Design a protein around this ligand. Structure first.
Ligand code: NI
Length: 496
């Protein structure tokens, strides 16, 4: 009834409203949302049994379960929920990347079971954002520090199935089953996280000792390690459905990526399978489209641009980018075909992919110049449009497609800047505005198809690969089912 894993760090304090990336897995073990995301893109009842919205889409009224207790035995009710929203909104700035935190105007408990949330605008993807691991999940208000969470908490008391019982710093965290959980309790009663900061040391600890499984993204489970494990029949390995897309964003307003033919050429010139086999140790899927077809609203049958250097070269040639005698880089009006790829210098994987991409483009006569900078400078370039090409990712999980599309129409964002050279940019932005505000599902799919097709046809992006969540486990443990939000390891499905 017990399992052991490993993690690079202790996760305390596990504040639901100041969650760090290394805490995001633990967050979901302890803290729960009003509504629960499903693979089909919808949300279903969870702590809220049901909900209604006003006709203008700005008032949302949630009817809550009446049988839920925080793990310390205090009731979950509308007042406790409203207190959490207040605590989050008191720190509104820290959450401004999440449109919901910007959208909420008022939260009011109408009764013990009725929670009303008022938004600035119709924003129907509201529900998908409530389903995120953070920040709109619930800690017992008794555990606030002086009536806030932004300045810290007391005990990490959620409604969830697991309780963080003990830490021994730099040694282990221990989660135990909440015996008073409102829902489906795990068969497992204890999960111990040995704190093993070095990923090679973690991997050896799995191979040798009584650690039952490891899981995570690239930062937690190195891609080369996972490839090795996936080869070895002594271990079980699994890869989730696609989460994020990794791509280049091409600046449609800056020469030479202002030319459709150049962007199309770039899309045909990258050998994605080889890049993945090499830099990513064959662990990810090739991305032909901005969103994987498993992404809600994105199963569009868009035409892939398959790796074809001959076609890439023909596109450049027709566009006037030709090789002079005795030269290996194309020129047009005496100007070489040069494209800057700016990336975060300290990011090893970005650097590895940039080098591969540079080499691919040499084969078609294009000079990709690599510029590694501080993250702070790359951030400013993205806001400003001071880039030729940049690495970029979607968010996956329940935020996409809506969140990623929403930012395309807002100034000071990479995707807005990248798209400035498109003749249909105003139509795209209007349609994104409409898709976010539409209550009609038919109109929603028609609009998503139009926006994504336009962006695909105009070759704004150079999709490279889809990132999956990795799990490696001892054979005796069993397969673990993936959850709709891949970080939410479904520990209740583990059967002793
Ligand atoms: Ni409705």
């Amino acid at each position: 009834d017990e399992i052991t894993t490993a993690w690079p760090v202790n996760v305390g304090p596990l504040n639901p409203h100041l969650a760090t990336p290394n805490q995001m897995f633990a967050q979901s073990m302890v803290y729960e949302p009003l509504v629960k995301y499903q693979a089909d893109g919808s949300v279903i009842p969870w702590l809220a049994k049901s909900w209604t919205h006003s006709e203008d889409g700005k008032t949302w009224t949630f009817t809550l379960r009446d049988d839920v207790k925080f793990s310390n035995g205090e009731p979950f009710d509308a007042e406790a929920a409203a207190e959490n929203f207040r605590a989050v909104l008191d720190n509104r700035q820290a959450h401004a990347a999440l449109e919901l935190a910007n959208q909420i105007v008022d939260v009011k408990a109408l009764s013990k079971t009725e929670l009303q949330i008022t938004l600035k605008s119709a924003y129907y993807p509201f529900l998908q954002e409530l389903a995120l691991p953070a920040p709109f999940r619930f800690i017992a208000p008794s555990q606030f520090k002086n009536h806030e969470t932004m300045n810290g908490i007391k005990a990490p008391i959620g409604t969830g199935p697991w309780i963080l019982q003990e830490s021994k710093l730099n040694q282990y965290d221990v989660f135990v089953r909440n015996e008073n959980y409102w829902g489906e309790k795990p068969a497992i009663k204890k999960i111990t996280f040995n704190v093993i900061p070095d990923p090679t040391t973690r991997a050896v600890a799995f191979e040798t000792g009584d650690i039952d499984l490891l899981y995570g993204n690239e930062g937690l489970l190195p891609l080369d390690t996972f490839a090795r494990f996936s080869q070895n029949p002594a271990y079980h390995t699994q890869l989730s459905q696609p989460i994020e897309t990794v791509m280049l964003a091409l600046n449609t307003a800056k020469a030479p990526t202002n030319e459709l033919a150049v962007r199309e050429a770039l899309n045909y010139a990258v050998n994605k399978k080889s890049l993945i086999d090499n830099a990513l140790y064959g662990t990810q899927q090739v991305a032909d489209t901005l969103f994987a077809p498993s992404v809600p609203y994105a199963n569009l049958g868009l035409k892939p641009s398959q790796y074809d250097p001959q076609k890439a070269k023909a596109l450049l040639e027709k566009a006037g980018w030709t090789l002079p005698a005795g030269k290996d880089i194309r020129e047009k009006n005496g100007q070489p075909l040069r494209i800057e790829l700016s990336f975060i210098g300290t990011d090893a994987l970005s650097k590895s992919m940039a080098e591969i991409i540079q080499a691919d483009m040499r084969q078609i006569g294009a000079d990709v110049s690599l510029i590694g900078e501080e993250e702070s400078s790359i951030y400013a370039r993205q806001r400003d449009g001071r880039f030729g090409m940049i690495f970029h990712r979607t968010a996956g999980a329940p935020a996409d497609p809506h969140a990623f599309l929403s930012s395309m129409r807002v100034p000071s964002h990479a995707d807005f800047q990248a798209q400035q050279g498109l003749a249909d940019k105003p139509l795209i932005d209007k349609e994104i505005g409409e898709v976010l505000a539409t209550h009609d599902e038919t109109q929603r799919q028609a609009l998503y198809r139009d926006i994504l097709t336009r962006l695909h046809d105009e070759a704004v992006y150079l999709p490279i690969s889809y990132i999956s969540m990795m799990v490696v486990s001892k054979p005796e443990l069993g397969n673990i089912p993936y959850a709709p939000i891949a970080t939410e390891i479904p520990f209740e499905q583990i059967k002793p």
